[PDB]
Write an enzyme that holds these catalytic residues in place. Structure first.
Site, PDB file in Angstrom:
ATOM      1  CG  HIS A  65      -1.783   1.221   1.571  1.00 53.86           C
ATOM      2  ND1 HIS A  65      -2.481   1.862   0.525  1.00 53.86           N
ATOM      3  CD2 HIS A  65      -1.937   1.927   2.509  1.00 53.86           C
ATOM      4  CE1 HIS A  65      -3.284   2.760   1.090  1.00 53.86           C
ATOM      5  NE2 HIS A  65      -2.793   2.850   2.276  1.00 53.86           N
ATOM      6  CG  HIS A 110       2.261   0.157   5.002  1.00 59.67           C
ATOM      7  ND1 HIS A 110       1.387  -0.570   5.243  1.00 59.67           N
ATOM      8  CD2 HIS A 110       1.700   1.559   5.178  1.00 59.67           C
ATOM      9  CE1 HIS A 110       0.166   0.159   5.597  1.00 59.67           C
ATOM     10  NE2 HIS A 110       0.271   1.414   5.388  1.00 59.67           N
ATOM     11  CG  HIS A 112      -2.601  -2.791   3.732  1.00 58.58           C
ATOM     12  ND1 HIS A 112      -3.552  -3.415   4.352  1.00 58.58           N
ATOM     13  CD2 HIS A 112      -2.886  -1.214   3.925  1.00 58.58           C
ATOM     14  CE1 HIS A 112      -4.349  -2.705   4.966  1.00 58.58           C
ATOM     15  NE2 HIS A 112      -4.015  -1.384   4.646  1.00 58.58           N
ATOM     16  CG  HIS A 402      -7.032   2.593   2.587  1.00 58.62           C
ATOM     17  ND1 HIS A 402      -6.044   1.632   1.623  1.00 58.62           N
ATOM     18  CD2 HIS A 402      -6.563   2.499   3.654  1.00 58.62           C
ATOM     19  CE1 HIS A 402      -5.635   0.915   2.501  1.00 58.62           C
ATOM     20  NE2 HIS A 402      -5.818   1.352   3.750  1.00 58.62           N
ATOM     21  CB  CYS A 453      -7.502   1.154  14.545  1.00 57.47           C
ATOM     22  SG  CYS A 453      -6.075   1.547  15.599  1.00 57.47           S
ATOM     23  CG  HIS A 458      -5.436  -2.154  17.877  1.00 58.90           C
ATOM     24  ND1 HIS A 458      -5.705  -0.957  18.317  1.00 58.90           N
ATOM     25  CD2 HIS A 458      -4.907  -3.104  18.738  1.00 58.90           C
ATOM     26  CE1 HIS A 458      -4.835  -1.007  19.778  1.00 58.90           C
ATOM     27  NE2 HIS A 458      -4.598  -2.067  19.882  1.00 58.90           N
TER      28      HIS A 458
HETATM   29 CU   LIG Z   1      -6.324   0.859  17.490  1.00 57.11          CU
HETATM   30 CU   LIG Z   2      -0.498   3.233   6.028  1.00 56.78          CU
HETATM   31 CU   LIG Z   3      -3.639   4.016   3.600  1.00 57.48          CU
HETATM   32 CU   LIG Z   4      -5.053   0.352   5.424  1.00 55.77          CU
END
Ligand SMILES: [Cu+2]
Ligand SMILES: [Cu+2]
Ligand SMILES: [Cu+2]
Ligand SMILES: [Cu+2]
Ligand SMILES: *[C@@H]1O[C@H](CO)[C@@H](O[C@@H]2O[C@H](CO)[C@@H](O)[C@H](O)[C@H]2NC(C)=O)[C@H](O)[C@H]1NC(C)=O
Ligand SMILES: *[C@@H]1O[C@H](CO)[C@@H](O[C@@H]2O[C@H](CO)[C@@H](O)[C@H](O)[C@H]2NC(C)=O)[C@H](O)[C@H]1NC(C)=O
Ligand code: NA
Length: 499
Positions: A65, A110, A112, A402, A453, A458
């Protein structure tokens, strides 16, 4: 060196020891953090991601992502596994081919998939502006002025209990730092400045969980960008930065030539600075090569407060100046029990068929979409308000959307909304018990957009929903390349999944 906007990116396993303790990792470009991907506003990025992973303990599949980039017309390139694509399997590659119109600022990339970014797949992503309105405020802005803050774990992510309070073993600043227990005097990062020059420091939280209290002894920091959004100048002496947020600040190298501590205190894990944990070094050219001797104050007199931030441009706020004053006003019920989070009574568990592929295959209302109860449709060309009242365990939760940035109409720890000139951003702390952090945006970007989150533990425990924005126009707005259409057949065949 920076790479991009057109580049290969190999994802590999390797051993690393960023705090002196060796462990295997998932790496982009062979380093932690990964190399900076960069270009200019409006550029075409084509990042061909080669999945070379072989260690199953950190997952051999991947998906990446591009955090904060809107992906308008390219929802298929956004990266969240089982929302916009199936994962890329090992020994295969995939070209994320997208454009960045109308955005310039500090971003990151990162993994995802699951909690895989915690295992190392994280790096900076900078979109420069050749006509930046803030250009005259500094002299230097380059790869040497990016500052990353990261949590680092000795235990591999796939061994972290779901829904647990998981705690890190080191803070890493630009990839280096010292372990909280069994502390060894391993190398600290050095950020070098020249007396009299002004620097655009691009501060990026690549955290999987903790927020940091960031400061530089003897220095103050003039904020000029928030999560990609240019701000009015705001001078502070400390920044509390939550997972996935970004700030640019001007650092004036206006103190005596010398060495100064850079501090990043996480909300969990090791407290303080004993043995040089939670630390890096600001070194002026000409200073002696030695550790700083500087002190933090006991309290910080000008900390960042989010309501003090205002956009540089006249962005305003969409809708009407009261609660519920939007075309589609929502209030999410955000909860935690028994190791699982939920939104509106449903804990997120990724579907077998990515949400986008379900919509392209003809599913056209949110009740036809899987996971059942985890997809909310949004109408097109409409003002959306989302209230995110806090109280769920494990806070403060940094919520991220997003496909969008948003006006922060109400911030943490302050009951007063702002319908005039709040900052816009993409990741926001929802605060503490009794707060009612509230965001607004307009729906001009068809596709399924994750809301979750950004504490990765989480998300893994279910703290997410999907906004299926403008379902009827998703297919015409987001034509898909053959290589994208090939991902789910390849993934399902490799994992013996039927669909
Ligand atoms: Cu959280
Ligand atoms: Cu991110
Ligand atoms: Cu994002
Ligand atoms: Cu995300
Ligand atoms: C947060 O603000 C939302 C509005 O943005 C509040 O939502 C109202 O909640 C009551 C019940 O609590 C309902 O009667 C209304 O229909 C909701 N929408 C409104 C008034 O516009 C929500 O209660 C607030 N939460 C907290 C904890 O303060
Ligand atoms: C709490 O949040 C409110 C709203 O963002 C802040 O109120 C603004 O304060 C500024 C600065 O003095 C005034 O220019 C605005 O007119 C206020 N707006 C509103 C709607 O009241 C307030 O300052 C924040 N509280 C704290 C302690 O920072
Ligand atoms: Na307005």
């Amino acid at each position: 060196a920076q790479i991009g906007p057109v580049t290969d990116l190999h994802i590999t396993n390797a051993n690393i020891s960023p705090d002196g303790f060796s462990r295997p990792a998932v790496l982009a470009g062979g380093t932690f953090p990964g190399p900076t991907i960069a270009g200019n506003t409006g550029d075409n990025f084509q990042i061909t991601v080669f999945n070379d992973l072989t260690d199953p303990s950190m997952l051999t599949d991947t998906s990446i992502h591009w955090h904060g980039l809107f992906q308008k017309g390219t929802n298929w390139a956004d990266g969240p596994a089982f929302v916009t694509q199936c994962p890329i399997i090992t020994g295969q590659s995939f070209d994320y081919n997208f454009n960045v119109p109308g955005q310039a600022g500090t971003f990151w990339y990162h993994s995802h998939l699951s909690t895989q970014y915690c295992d190392g797949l994280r790096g900076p992503f900078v979109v420069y502006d050749p006509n930046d309105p803030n250009a005259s405020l500094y002299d230097v802005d380059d790869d040497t002025t990016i500052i990353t803050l990261a949590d680092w774990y000795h235990t591999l992510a796939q061994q972290e209990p779901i829904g647990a309070a998981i705690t890190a073993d080191a803070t890493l600043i630009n990839g280096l730092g010292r372990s909280f227990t069994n502390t060894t005097a391993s190398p600290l990062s050095v950020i070098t400045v020249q007396s009299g020059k002004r620097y655009r420091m691009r501060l990026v939280s690549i955290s999987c969980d903790p927020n940091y209290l960031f400061s530089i002894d003897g220095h103050d920091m003039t904020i000029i960008e928030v999560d990609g959004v240019n701000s009015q100048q705001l001078t502070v002496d400390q920044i509390q930065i939550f997972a996935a947020q970004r700030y640019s600040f001007v650092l004036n190298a206006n103190q005596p030539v010398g060495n100064y501590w850079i501090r990043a205190q996480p909300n969990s894990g090791g407290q303080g600075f004993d043995g040089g944990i939670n630390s890096a070094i600001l070194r002026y050219e000409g200073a002696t090569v030695e550790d700083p001797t500087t002190t933090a104050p006991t309290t910080f007199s000008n900390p960042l407060v989010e309501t003090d931030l205002h956009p540089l441009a006249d962005l305003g706020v969409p809708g009407q100046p009261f609660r519920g004053g939007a075309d589609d006003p929502l209030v999410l019920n955000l909860a935690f029990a028994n190791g699982r989070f939920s939104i509106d009574g449903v804990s997120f568990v990724p579907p077998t068929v990515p949400v986008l592929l379900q919509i392209l295959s003809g599913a056209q209302n949110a009740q036809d979409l899987l996971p059942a109860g985890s997809v909310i449709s949004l109408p097109s060309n409409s003002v959306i308000e989302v209230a995110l009242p806090a109280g769920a365990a494990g806070g403060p939760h940094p919520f991220h959307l997003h496909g969008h940035n948003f006006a922060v109409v109400q911030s943490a720890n302050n009951a007063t909304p702002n319908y005039v000139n709040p900052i816009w951003r993409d990741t926001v702390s929802i605060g503490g018990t009794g707060d009612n952090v509230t965001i607004r945006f307009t729906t001009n970007n068809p596709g399924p957009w994750f809301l979750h989150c950004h504490i990765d533990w989480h998300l893994e425990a279910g703290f997410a929903i999907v906004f299926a924005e403008d379902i009827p126009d998703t297919a015409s707005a987001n034509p898909v390349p053959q290589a994208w259409s090939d991902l789910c057949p390849a993934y399902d065949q490799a994992h013996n999944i039927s669909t």
